[model samples]
Target: KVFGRCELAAAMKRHGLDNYRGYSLGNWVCAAKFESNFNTQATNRNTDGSTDYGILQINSRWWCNDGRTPGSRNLCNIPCSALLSSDITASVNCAKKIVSDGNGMNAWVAWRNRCKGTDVQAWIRGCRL
Candidate 1:
């Protein structure tokens, strides 16, 4: 299910992602907006025969299996489809692992293109959460 920005913000905060892994809530909010528009089921197929999964657009190349692919790293130990759920616990856990691995938000292409080095404060503006 898709979530509104405020809802996402609150959920992320509740998940302790508002200040997770040395990154700010604003950075996460910005990344999510550009990556999936807050849609939990979001996916994007790249031209390189890889698919991005979930709100974080985690790549099948290194994260999870799409069931049709072979030799995935499956670092999260969950199916790719698991990422595409309204209950974001699995996704959030995987994301934390990713950030802990030192990629930070640079793990996301959308973050690199849009949120990186940008004044992300506005992403949380007036959410009042």
Candidate 2:
């Protein structure tokens, strides 16, 4: 599923992403704006062959088991395919696990490049969450 801006914001909130690890819903919303643009099935193949999956673009190298990334930590203990679904449960859970693991939002380069150290409040302004 491809989520509209407000829709995505509200959905992430419902999944407990609001203020998660000090990251506001706007931070997540902004990260998705640059990562997969809220597309659940989005995927990006890195030069090293690791793939990033879902809206937050979690990487196969350390998050999901793609059955191809050698030495993958598979910290999320989930198949990479699970991150591509519209339900978003797996992706949300995995995202929480990433932050709760002490990695913070910078674990996602998209968040670093776009969402970090910025006034992201505007991203959630129109959302009723």
Candidate 3:
């Protein structure tokens, strides 16, 4: 369905991945920004919202686990929540698979895109954090 960076980040946060929010702009932007520009209405139309139907542009057909919790062994059908569950590592790992496939962006690129070249961190640094 719809896949946007902000939307996906929020979804991941809600589902569990606390550090997954706005980490970088590498594949996150392409996969999220280029996917739906943050729109939630995006969809595959043919696969029905059951597969690959979410903000992260993930195919429910291959990712969403069937009623299984995060960290399950046979969670091939694991849903978005599980992938974004409190298990930050699992969620990040799932994102890595999608982001690293076929010339996809890597963590370094992601960091550079979102942080290195931009003043976002500087701005954040100025914040009350």
Candidate 4:
């Protein structure tokens, strides 16, 4: 499913993402927009030959086991395929795990390139969260 900006905001908030690890809801929403365009099933291949999966695009190399990548460490202990589900529980959970692992939101390139240091109020504007 492709979420509208507000929908993504609400969903992430519902999942306890707002202010998580010191990152605001808008920060997450903005990063998601840049990462996957709010598409739940989005995937991308990294230059290292690892694949990123789902809305937040969790990486296969260290976060999840793609069952294909060599040396893939399932630190989240989740299959990469679960990240593609529209339910979003897996993605949200794993994303939190990533932050809790001390990587913080910097693990996401999109957040650095687009959302970092930018005011994210507009990302969740009128979202009524």
What Cα-based lDDT does every candidate model obtain?
Answer: 0.85, 0.89, 0.42, 0.91
Model 1 TM-score, all chains together? 0.93
Cα-lDDT of candidate 1: 0.85
Better candidate number, 1 or 4, judged by TM-score: 4
- Report how far off residue 64 is in candidate 1 (Å): 1.0
Q: Lowest summed lDDT over 10 consecutive residues: which window, candidate 2? A: 102-111
Per-residue lDDT of 7-27 in model 2, one digit per residue for the tens?
Answer: 988889999999998888898
After TM-score superposition, what is the CA distance of residue 12 in candidate 3 from its true location, in Å? Answer: 10
TM-score of 2: 0.94
On TM-score, the leading prediction is: 4
**Model 1 alpha-carbon drift over 4 Å, by segment:** none
lDDT of 3 by residue, 84-128 (tens): 333334445566555444333433332345544444333222222
TM value for model 4: 0.96
Q: Model 1: which residue pairs collide?
A: none
Candidate 2: which pairs clash?
Answer: none
TM-score of each: 0.93, 0.94, 0.37, 0.96
Model 3: CA > 4 A from native: 1-24, 40-43, 47-50, 66-77, 81-92, 99-129
How does candidate 3 score on lDDT? 0.42
RMSD after Cα superposition, model 1? 1.2
On lDDT, the candidate that comes out on top is 4
Q: At residue 98, give the lDDT of candidate 4.
A: 92
- Model 3 / residue 40 / CA error / Å: 5.8
